[PDB]
């Protein structure tokens, strides 16, 4: 029984699974987890990059000494839940503390052969269609004292985001309550009398200062400024559909559940928080935090 890195297999190409799984709590066992050095995140990042490359493969043609853009059937449905599964000689430990911060000892640890159905959703700033936290909202970071270290936020009440083509719609009441919850959670870690400020991303490139995602085969970039303009009838976010063009090859509506956020802290008596992150390893890490791989 020791920590190890190995290639998990996948299940729903991937192998069948779950006509009847089995979770099993290991009694009297406490296990140390570290969501920030979990090689499952690296494996899933690589798998998602390969998934996108393979989805782009049928849009090229190898005619002569080059690859040319070609047919491309647009509606390429990507997100179906996948499960990562330990191979022979290994086992996946799963934390069950509903408020686990990701870095520390879990007192209620079960053992599994496969993870839950994880939806590979590529999105920025907002985490959509993910898992929810029981009871309380959770905030997780390697080092809260260290700004520019991404802050992963898991809610307990999801927020419906209904987008059409081109804008998105969020209820002001639900989002107001969500922001209040996040503000109190941040006050817990940064100071009680400290005031929380939500402001727009502090970058410049319009590709990262927006909430971007895939809405029915087309990629949307939405100005999310109306969500981060607060200090502690219906919000319509303006959006633009951008076409992905691969540089080196020669020549509508959807509803989602907002289940998480990615924030970055500034760096007085207050604290400014801005939507950040961008790296998708934090997107996958927001779901693989309560797992680890061990060798028996």
């Amino acid at each position, epitope marked *: 029984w020791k920590e190890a890195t190995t290639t998990l297999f996948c299940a729903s190409a991937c192998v069948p699974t779950d006509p009847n799984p089995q979770e099993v709590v290991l009694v009297n066992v406490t296990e140390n987890f570290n969501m920030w050095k979990n090689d499952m995140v690296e494996q899933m990042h690589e798998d*998602i*990059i390969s998934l*996108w*490359d393979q989805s*782009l493969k049928p849009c*090229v043609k190898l005619t002569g000494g080059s*690859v040319i853009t070609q047919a491309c059937p647009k509606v390429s449905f990507e997100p179906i839940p996948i499960h990562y599964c330990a191979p022979a000689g290994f086992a996946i430990l799963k934390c069950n503390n509903k408020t686990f911060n990701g870095t520390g000892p879990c007192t209620n640890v079960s053992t599994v052969q496969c993870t839950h159905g994880i939806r590979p959703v*590529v*999105s*920025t700033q907002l985490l959509l269609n993910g898992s929810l936290a029981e009871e309380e909202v959770v905030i997780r970071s390697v080092n809260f004292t260290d700004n*520019a270290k991404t802050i992963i936020v898991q809610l307990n009440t999801s927020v419906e985001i209904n987008c059409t083509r081109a804008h998105c719609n969020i209820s002001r009441a639900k989002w107001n309550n969500t922001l209040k919850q996040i503000a109190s959670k941040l006050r817990e870690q940064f100071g009680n009398n400290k005031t929380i400020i939500f402001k727009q991303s502090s*970058g*410049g*490139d*319009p*590709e*990262i200062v927006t909430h*971007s*995602f*895939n809405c029915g085969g087309e*990629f949307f970039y939405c100005n999310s400024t109306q969500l981060f303009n607060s200090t502690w009838d219906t919000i319509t976010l303006p959006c633009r559909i951008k*076409q*992905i*063009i*691969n*540089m*080196w*090859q*020669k020549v509508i509506r959807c509803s989602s559940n907002i289940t998480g956020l990615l924030l970055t802290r500034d760096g007085n008596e207050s604290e400014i928080f801005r939507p950040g*992150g*961008g*790296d*998708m390893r934090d*997107n996958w890490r927001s779901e693989l935090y309560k797992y680890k791989v061990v060798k028996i």
Partner: nanobody
Amino acid sequence: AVQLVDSGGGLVQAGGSLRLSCVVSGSIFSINAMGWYRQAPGKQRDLVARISGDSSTYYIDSVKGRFTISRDNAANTVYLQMNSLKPEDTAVYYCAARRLPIGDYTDWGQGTQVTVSS
């Protein structure tokens, strides 16, 4: 996978010009956006410029008017022409490429050192 090679950096004087090159190799037909970051010892990263598949570009305000990012298809290269160079441009520059449809970059080079004196 993808391999990026940065080159071009060196010593010049204030008001001189440089041309950084990022050569691209491997499974490159999934890149939809490349760019140049720069970092000086003791400071945070800085996305200075980026080009996308549709040839649209972005530059930070500090380099708007002095820097130009462009693409050489016949050479699989991305060029960053730096003009009116100022001492505030001294850093290690890395070229980066994105192989996911959105998000931050996925592939990075080894970096090249740009220094300028006054």
